[PDB]
Amino acid sequence: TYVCGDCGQENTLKSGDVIQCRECGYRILYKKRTRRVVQYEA
Amino acid sequence: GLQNVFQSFGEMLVEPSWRYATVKFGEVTVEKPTFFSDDKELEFLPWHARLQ
């Protein structure tokens, strides 16, 4: 799952050639953070 | 600056050795930056260029 840039939409694209956002036109994608438990030492 | 630079340069007649070829430059215009995407033209911003 990948988040687009100025537009809010999940691309969810894993193809090598698929780098462009759908219905947006911009080619900047941010990787989304899933629900994973991570431990930190305070 | 650009208009003065282009106006200063003068193109003389071009002869290989009757027919002759001469070229002239008119008013120079510069458009705002844009991105030539495959779908359609899109707004271009400095951070888009930095990331891409």
Ligand SMILES: [Zn+2]
């Ligand atoms: Zn988009």
